[model samples]
Target: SPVNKTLNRLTNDLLKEVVERGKTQKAQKLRAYIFDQLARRLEASLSQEQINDLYNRIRGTGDYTKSESFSEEQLKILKEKVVPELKRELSDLSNGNVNILGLDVSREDKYAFDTTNIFSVWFSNNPAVYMPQHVKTQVEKTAKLNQPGKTRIVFSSLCLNETAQIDFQQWAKENNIELVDIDSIDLKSVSETDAQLLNLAKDELGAMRKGKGGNPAAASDLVRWVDVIIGESSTYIDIDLPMNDKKVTVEVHSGFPVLLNMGSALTKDGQQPAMENPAFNTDMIAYSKDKEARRQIIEGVAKKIIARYENCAKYIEESKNEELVRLKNSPGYKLFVEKTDGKFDLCTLRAAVSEAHQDALSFATFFGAEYFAKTFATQELIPVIKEAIQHQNQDLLTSVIENHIEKQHLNDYPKTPDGIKKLLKSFQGIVYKPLVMEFSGPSAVSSSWVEAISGRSIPRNFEYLAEPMSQPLRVLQHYACVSGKANFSSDNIPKWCEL
Candidate 1:
């Protein structure tokens, strides 16, 4: 009751403020400015607080951090209290999270520095853009480039800058190049690992410069070592990072192989393909026993990547088609559409629904088959499905219904083990074996189909919805509900119909 009262009061206050702000220009301006500042400052603060609170709540209730295993009460609190609180907090702070209401932010190009003599090029995705070699050459050629007098190149094999000043002098005497001030590049500006890398490059460059003025025999030996060290080495390894932590690594490959430019993928026969570029000469195998398993795996990965984007596009299309059907079926939605000059846009209606009830809008958006298909193809649905399978979690299903179904009293299935077990008893009349049954003997089913049943070639049922005709049916039921005709059941809808 207290929660309800608090929510009601908050809602009323929000509405009153909106009305007052609407009436007064000064109030609106002040509110807008205040909200903008609040959004910027409190954005991360509220999220961090919520996450900490959730962690604390779980710790307190003995769900997350406890010496003893969680009792039913602790588990209940973790599920019923902590998680729900976190989700509610997250939902309330949505606009604050990504600055969704603010102006769109586009990524801008970053400057690159080719700290020569330090022997390393640094750039943000655009190496040639910011510090063009031509520009640097022109700067060097100019007599006015004497703005900074020649300085000693810094060299260091040590972790710290130990020999830059001394080594430069020694190297300068033997080499034709004169000694300037040995300045260590600010490797600290780069990340921890990158800083070390910059140091290593500086050391190698120093060695090269040192070799220049040394005795002919020694210089030749140093040059040979340099050729061996810098010429021929590359590492290819994947490093795992902790949760939410992001990092980048710099690697030097052997044989002085030119690093392929980032956008080289976009060029034909280049190292990498652009995001939207199709793979060349790609063929889909209908059925093949001749192909090696490794080839099949490669094909599978490629197919998955393609399917992810295809499914996403298909989901968008299906949502539009389903919304049209809902507009036709639901009297309320139809009326609303009619009022809007007979032009129906689900996005526009979705915004309206959010204004009325955000949770309801979310629910309506999710239960659609298109949403599920899109989620599956993209691997977003895996966590939920896995949780259900592992924990037999009904609450997740309830949450899905709450978020998608919106209507409260549709089907209140048993929520207990005993009650659910009783319901399962009814299904015993039908075949009760696992969905997948293994068989080696030849039967009506093809080997592939049998393998599919056994999870080897699991139906990318997600792929089917990519077809224009199949997609509309995917979200027709959800669209109907959104249109205000919630009485129509999913079972009532036909799988296929003549267009």
Candidate 2:
């Protein structure tokens, strides 16, 4: 029992350390060492199930762990046999120099390529137009191309659908590119430890995908081995590779036209023009009409790729400088520094303020004027009041505060039952102008006033006031209901009932 408790405590402690520090090679080595020692010291006391449980729980491999239960005989074999073999195998595990390069196409360019009729004709009819043969040709011509024995071009079949994959594979093979299928890799030759590590890596990748609203299937594991991901969006391309790994991701935005159907084209008035003689056919060969356009688009893709690779470093540095310059010139940056009196560093405060402003603007737009009014009160009005008080600018404080309240008409009345009565009077004036004129005793004794003096309830629909006058109506209803002066019912008092 003492041995069991001590073993469990040490196991938990090691697991916590591994989790906190993250699963580095050093941490894993330390874990393995501890497990080996425990297996030897408590060989007689430790049950097969306990040993299996410890491996499953601590390693996070679950079902991926060796399925066979470990007996005392197995524990002896672990100490005498498995431990030394693992050490020798793991020593070479992280030694290889793996270079991963990514090639990505921008969403805009991809959309253009997919939609333009000329581009689609080339892509579907002439494989030379869509294939990266130009990339292969130009790259091969360069002296430092491929780096031969030192570099490996990793490809993922998952990036393309079955039809696309077939074409891509043929192209790659013709170019002498060796595409590696991660599933086909012989893990047994590498080591059982390496196999387990790969499985763990897959689990981590799955968790990351799930966190980002993606449901990663079992096949998603193949992504870990994929050095190059070809897609419309460059999001995956931008994801940082593991630390200390020399890698380069090339995002290629080839701005090419897409395929469009002539039949589907609309006229200026949003109506389809009648065809002289309509012919219905699904034959793709009939639509592949543009030869010159296809040639130009393919040439464009090749030229762009060559240019990008040649001047990538210079372009990257220029982009970095341009981004910094853009942020510095932003209105949000100026406002943030002005409000904070330059005490807060933009390095930390800039992004936070920008994000907050974006969220506030979005919410304000969705909720309309009242939401903006509240936002302005909190963000601008309160800050101004504080500054005014701090500086002891009595005249400035009074004038600014008075101007804001008057301009916004926030000082009209108290926010109470009395305010509701005043609001009701103002609303009555707008809806029933003749009643007000009659009550005031019009100078010319107008017919409008005479009609109002008859005292018939004026027929009115408040639909026009729904947006602009809703705030005042809401205020009136809130106070009226709170003060027990009115029972808000849906049919009779629509505004108050909704409020």
Candidate 3:
């Protein structure tokens, strides 16, 4: 846990070392790939030449991050190598080229497969690639684009996790979905290009695996150059068919990430977090083209979700969890009990802080000259650090920053000068505590467009400070904040506080 503090500090330090200012969407992806490659090799004590070699391969130029100016090679890689390869692979695989080992369906080396049967593809650790329903939509979309009515089977290397698979399995059976188990087939033979592609994938996987708290296999799939082609999901920027495609993305601004928050729901006896139970992976979802089918999908998913909650409620009821009394006595749970006898809704059986979300709120380190001027741990010469924040050159700020570090005896947090400079550099640009934007519409500006225009990641990271039930209402209020809507200011309230 102590190493974790350094890890976070180290990660943030690594991220801050370079400025990723890719102008285009694809260019941004390339920047992400490069940085990921760089960080993966952080322990290797790389040579300048080796670092430049990575930059050159992707950007077609050699420049590493340090004493820096933007090397501008990140743009080069996207323009020449990665984008083109992605396109070629997307087109080739979509056109049924079986060279990309275990990807396209081809009857070679006894790795026989049908051309006709294709539907869902799972990549989520025996789970579906996209959310299951999105896969269903992609399946139909592929059918619409590629053929008339040919959506047939799910494609996966691993069988579904037993408990997690139960309800989805029934739904799959009803939908006539079959599993295309490539793992059962031989993929021993390979093309030279296939070997190269597979090697790239292997290298990428090694890079990823080396980094703990490893992320999804998305990048390695890109390295393999065939994931998007084979498993068409709407998460990443979609590739062209050689093809064209596209989706709307949305989420709850309620929960924290799972790493720190072990999720809601405890085990029946020990009161340990029950979220590890694979059955919780049963994400209820639905999709349809026809109105009739749409209704059926909704009701079907609703039924499954209701059943899921009942099971969870049963677990909670049976749990010898000391936390159970607190949950039961809570006002929200009491209301749920009154309303539905605690039978239908999961309202009272709230999830973990990670799972159900902390019903309260929290805050974060605000990088402002006024607030962090003190956080910088400089008191007497506080103006010095504040002035340092205004100044650009870290050299100009270095003297006073270190002066504070030595005199204040506040080596408790960051034991060095760069940490202060990192804070100073970040705060130097701010005009206010936070930069919030509002669009005059019923809906928010497409986040995709926002990312394209402003290369910043807009996470619901703030959700950690927000409440669970508070989110749905926030979206409603977000829409309400628009013109000619229920303006909350009618009552002379300090409107911001109320909202």
Candidate 4:
């Protein structure tokens, strides 16, 4: 009955003539009503099998939080059926080219794989070579078209820990150029993390290098060639020559040097920018009909790497099977759940841990132990910290705190009579004050701040702030703000903040 009702609501074959006469808003309301009812039913009672049967009856829920049954079914379909079809398509596109670098590309299609779309997945961890040939070509072409005589090249690392900045400074000196370095930039300003459920990936893992206890050596290596280092606090600008403090405006090319605020376009007065602005887009085109060729190249290269690591998959599979067997014999999988008690299931915990571990492995492989030191102490501890906050679970939080120091080989929590008193003062105006007071009672905040700056130990009273869910969006906003620091309002707030 439910299925039939859903089907009728979706198609409305009986009312096709009337439907054609309805207004757009009315049609949208009807569609929403049907979809919401279908979602409620799926979320309430549908088994994975039933959900699969009813898949075509629902649409556009965008609700990744609940509906684990539906999610699993979707994943199975993607892994089993869709992926195989993609593989066949990739095989045809490969056409005997094993290495992606040597693949032939005509001049017309050269612009297809630029920094915007391709770089995120393709060059995230790979060594990108700006060889003499490519650089020369870019400079020559840019100069010819834009009538460019002189240009400045700025290189900056997103990671801004101390060690990374030191190496960056050294690198800058070697090349004799200006250097910009900051400490840590908040991620919340750049993207909406909760909305998209952005996966904890290798990039985020690698970013942990700037955390308090992160490895100096690894940080240095990652930023050796960087010219700018952005951190959580402070901003810097790179210029060929020093100018007066007097503020002035200069216009560059219309589409170049555009500003962004929280990954959204913003006006000069911190308001949202109009969608019609051409500066918000980067144009890249391919002349031929082979539009899918680049996607195929990416998929093909990705599969080869995945195939080489089949052994890792086998190991994981074996582990899961053994764990399942162990749970069947014991008090149950619930007893072995790592962070949660009997409420969470082993499958969910394993998935979460597995995801974090994969990102951890990537960090280890990319920059080694230094990155590990940073991540284990800061980034990896975020979920634990958040859990502590959510349940008012002070003992659990304390245990986590102790476990982190011991596991990560961190120094003892700072202790000073005066320092402890000062630590209490710093939390007065902040969101984390209550938590800090619970642990150390009001006087340890400033003390912890000093201890953190001295690189001694984080104060026992120092409230560990979990990474804000909105960090990516905040980081993006900060980046846009700092990037346009000169364009400030009368109150010194960023002008683009209006947008």
Candidate 5:
């Protein structure tokens, strides 16, 4: 119908806007309006099945073709009435403001989460009472230790990308800080990528690398001996590489300043920095560089670094205890205890259980009693059940089950009590037997034969059976005695089993 054509046109238009302009507020709002109109029309005229097909098409599940079910009159009503209303509704809508935080440095830069801009914005907004009491106390303690020229401040940014490292080098030179460019170090077993990056360092830095055997260890030792170290991100310096048995004092400098790519930096009210992308907030960097924002971030990060260094051992012990407590309370740890009978090494158990639990949970929901039965039958049968189901053949299931039972000579088993017991024994011995043994002809025969010989009808209600463990047993009894051809009815005699 023409209504279907209108809906398809509307869907295409909305999808086009979303794709071309991205999911901006205007495009999102237009999509919502179009979906509402489509939903209303679908609810008024279509059955649940028809509506489901339309929804599936809208969701991109099938071919993108318009429905042909609507009449010409219905199509005219949709075009003349519905489409105009939808157009009128969406004509005057605003694009709306989008608050974004953080800067987008080069694609490879990991400093995307660096919240330097947020802190900068906060300090700029509330300079008088911005510093926390503990932080202030730490800052005061480190203030005396800032003996300028006596205590060398080595600016190192080895962990940063090429662009950031170069920026930091220029900044350090302008500030007259004795910076160490460790970018020239030839680290042991460094990847081809890292080696190439190191070679891009300036000739002066290259000369320093040559003087120190061009090894990362030599440069690491030099940084280790320094009074203070500042970097973009601490990858090279935070290690115990034989030469640096003693931990080095370090602080992180702000990387790239935050720049808004396609969103607002401040919130709607402009009181606080937008929390959308807090890490990408580089407003602080821009403010600090421009002398418009408070210049306390560098000093603030420095104080925290110093504080951490001073209490490193205490922090390490606390972290170790916390991790131990967490492991002891975890389910993986419990699995480890059961696996090892509590006599195994606790250190290795946590990691082992963690890996095993991950594998176990992936398939935990899909495998159980019913699944096991189906899979067992699929593997044992001649004409496989999976193949039958895939091809939509109903008769193949019966044939497959019957053919396997006949081929195994299951019908020859006796119908007496002793015979039923023996059949069960044999069934249990088979590695890939069905969940309900009565599905096989011989097992059904033996069960019915037992009932006839004993002259007792087994109860159909299997309330006495336990959960999960009793499920298959209940199916066996119910099928063999009450439902299968071996059932103990007058018309269906013991000779029925022979047939």
Candidate 6:
């Protein structure tokens, strides 16, 4: 209810400002304005009295000066009575939690492509001309003038600055890059571990501006690591916020079965692709309304992230000899590897699925990636890699519905890219499982005999009104119901059809 109400207020005001791009204006002007307004909206929504009431209870019922962890009994009360209703008021999960674009991660040109072009031939003909011929001429002229290998336009609607709108026309001849300037979220307090959760956030938002800058004004403590989500929204992440009480070292699996990214998910010739994309995505995220459940979810995820990246890095680092050992030693392994002898350069290959259970292109990334520490590119972990092949010796596989109350609800996911990439870090460690799904159409309900099936015998004269076709039988039933030859019951109609 608090998130719902808070979000509701924030949305109302936000849309009000953008509804007409009123008093303020576009992206350049709105970012700070919107940011301020967001805080205002959030602050306006909080019932300080409500929070104070909860706070007093926290202080009253338990040892006010807690030595770090709250008592289990107190937490039990908090989890049961005090928290459930209040978590909504205090929780700020939806705000930008993890930013894929921030820090060292650059998302700028990921949306651009090889075929991307600077200009498209446009005609201002209001009366509407430009059959295929108009395009042929306009495009042909531009095409001929600077016919280079790849069309390189060092510009895009995005990243355009203050003069972006006016200047954008030079390229698109028109633009809609409404750089609507932007961008909570986070809360804190009390007997402990959750406090670090907020501090990490507080420190994060604070360092963002003045060379990374100050945290937003108002309240400083019920903090969280705030990050940009999209054009105007926010989502929060608790990844780096370790469980001061628990979360220790994590376990991980060695690499993963490479999913297809088409031409480049694997090795081609001697050139293996180098992509830093995740090996698997821990797509699910949770914030428990109950404190114990909350701790469990957060700590559980903290461990899973450990298991995930631990496994992911292993996926990348697993040796080549290991690959061939697994491959040459397994069934489908030989289908992909050729090993008279082995060297690393000739070792340039990112396999589809691994025999030794390793990653494809993503492996190269971990070596020197800061995530793994100061790794290498030139030094060759193994000089050449172990062959990565797919070898499911004798594993059984099957599928089933996740929840069948209504229909299958397999996953709940974000900018489509934002949706997924957000999970990349918020739920930083991805773990992709191997379960390919398809409509195998076990067997169709045969339409061949489709069915000579019909419902029940019609009323006395109802059969008289019907000839032989499926239609007359129905009219006879329709007459029976309306004319009272049979009582007008919902089942009576079906009964006639069943015959």
Model 1 gets an lDDT of 0.26
Q: Write the per-residue lDDT of candidate 1 for residues 292-350, one digit (tens) a residue.
A: 32133223322332232224223323433344343234333444445775453322443
Predict model 3's lDDT versus the native: 0.30
| Better-scoring candidate (TM-score), 5 or 6 | 5
Q: Which candidate is the best by TM-score?
A: 3
- Candidate 6 residue spans exceeding 4 A from truth: 1-95, 101-499
On a 0 to 100 scale, what is the lDDT of residue 493 in model 4?
25
Model 6: per-residue Cα lDDT over 1-499, one tens digit each:
3333433454344434332334322232223333343434433444675444434444553334422333344335433543332222112222112111111111111111111111221211121222135433433343333223111111112222335434433432322211111112122313233444334333323332221322222111112111111101111111111112221112111111100010102111112111111111111111112233224323332232223222432332342333323323332323233442222111122222311122222322222122211121222323232221112211110000111111333255322433333323332112111100000000010110011112322111111111221232222222211112101112111232232
As for model 1, its CA RMSD to the true structure in angstroms is 32.3
Looking at model 1, residue 108 earns an lDDT score of 15
**Over 4 Å off in model 1, which ranges?**
1-139, 142-195, 206-499
CA lDDT of 270 in candidate 1?
A: 23
Clash count for each candidate, listed in order shown: 15, 7, 10, 47, 5, 54
Q: Give the TM-score of candidate 4.
A: 0.19
lDDT of 5 by residue, 72-172 (tens): 55445555665554443233121111111212112222122221211100010121232245533433332223322111122234334456556544543
- What is the C-alpha lDDT profile of model 4 across 1-499, one tens digit per residue? 4444533444343223223344433444334333443345334455666565445434423443222233455435533554343223212223211122223322121221111110000111222322234433443333233221222222324433446446545643444333322223233542232111111222222433322212222222222111112111111211111222443223211111112111233323112112211111011111111223433332332232222222322222233233333322322122333335434322243333222222223212222333333533556655654444445553553344345546756444323322322332232223222211211121111122112123221111101112211122222233212233322112212222233
For model 3, the superposed segments whose C-alpha errors exceed 4 Å read 1-122, 125-130, 134-149, 152-160, 163-185, 195-214, 217-220, 223-499
Question: Model 6, residue 174: displacement in angstroms?
Answer: 21
lDDT of 3 by residue, 224-340 (tens): 122222232111112111112321112111111000001112233121111111001111111211233223322332233233334644544553443554444444445545666
Q: Which has the better lDDT: candidate 1, or candidate 5?
A: 5
Evaluate residue 331 in candidate 5 and report its C-alpha lDDT on the 0 to 100 scale: 48
Local distance difference test values of all predictions, in order: 0.26, 0.31, 0.30, 0.28, 0.31, 0.24
